[PDB]
Structures are given as C-alpha cells and as structure tokens.
Amino acid sequence: AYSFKVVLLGEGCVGKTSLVLRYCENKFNDKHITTLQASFLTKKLNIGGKRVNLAIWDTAPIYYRDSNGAILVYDITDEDSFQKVKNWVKELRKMLGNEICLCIVGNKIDLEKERHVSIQEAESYAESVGAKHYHTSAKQNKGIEELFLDLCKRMIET
C-alpha cells in the first residue's frame, strides 16, 4: 500500500488549515482562529483497488523532509497572496527535488463577486513551473475531494 507525505504552503489567511480540516473531518468555522491540533493528520484512501496512507502536514527541513506532494494555496480575493506564490515555489525547489507533485490552488471561490486574481494568469504560472492548478471552497466544500484524489494519482504514477 502507498504511503505519501503532503505539505501545505502559502501566505497566512488563505485557507491552508481550513482545507485540511474540511478534507479530514468535514468541519469548517469562520468565527474564531482555527489551528491544526497536530503536526499532520492521516487520511486513508482506496484508488482502483490499491490502498493509500496520506499524511497531510500544516504549519501555523523537518517540515519539508520526505514530501511526495505539495499544495500551495492563495486567496482568489487577494492578488498579493497569489503574487507571493512564486516565493514558495523558489523555496520548495531549494528544499526538495523537482520530482515532487505540486498543486497550485485558488481557494475561497464562494466569494467570486470579490475576485482579484486572474484565472488565466494563475493557470499560466502553474503550467510554466510544471504544476496543476485547482479551484476550491472550504466553506461550501467544493473542489476538495477532487484535489486530493488527483494528487494521490499523480504521486502513484511517479
């Protein structure tokens, strides 16, 4: 059975912790500060027969060490959060081998009426650095099951 390590990256306030809490426990709160009550949480999967042990890491070399995939999140309502995405890529590449499966993720899509990131622009940067781009809303639970499933499959292929 497959054992994968996945790290969450990006600026504060974008929804990194909400994403892990939503995926792993189906909880979401916008009333107080959320903090992961562990270094990582475990999720088990079955993909076309085979089992997958997933360890999802969050933070408020030990962190980067032994990672197979990476989830780099920005906030669709906030252009600075996106423009800082490139700093994290040019830190992920310093820490780890360019063999790691990277996701770039536009979170908070329930707030579309307040969008400030260009979809074209975001998807273009993703392709140029070899990664895939995804849209999520932790609040409404949209796009998240698909993000983790596709990442798991990508890590299985290489």
Ligand X SMILES: Nc1nc2c(ncn2[C@@H]2O[C@H](COP(=O)(O)OP(=O)(O)O)[C@@H](O)[C@H]2O)c(=O)[nH]1
> At 57, which amino acid appears?
W
Instruction: Find the part of the chain contacting ligand X (CB under 6 A) among 48-56, 82-90, 96-104, 133-141.
Output: 133-141
Token readout for 31 is 């009333």
Residues 21-50 that bind ligand X (CB under 6 A): 29-30, 34
18 binds Mg ion (CB under 5 A): no
In whole angstroms, the minimum distance from the beta carbon of 16 to Mg ion comes to: 5
Helix or strand holding residue 74 (H, E): strand 69-75
- Find the binder of ligand X among 7, 14, 70, 71 (CB under 6 A): 14
16 binds ligand X (CB under 6 A): yes
- Find the binder of Mg ion among 4, 8, 17, 122 (CB under 5 A): 17
- Find the binder of ligand X among 72, 138, 147, 155 (CB under 6 A): 138
The phi and psi torsions of 140 (rounded to 5 degrees) equal -100, -5
> At 113, which amino acid appears?
K
Comparing C-alpha atoms, which of 147, 104, 139 is closest to residue 18? 139
Token readout for 128 is 């140029």
Calpha distance 53→43 (Å, rounded) = 6
Q: How many residues bind Mg ion (CB under 5 A)?
A: 1
Residues 73-112 that bind ligand X (CB under 6 A): 107-108, 110-111
* Binding stretches for Mg ion (CB under 5 A): 17
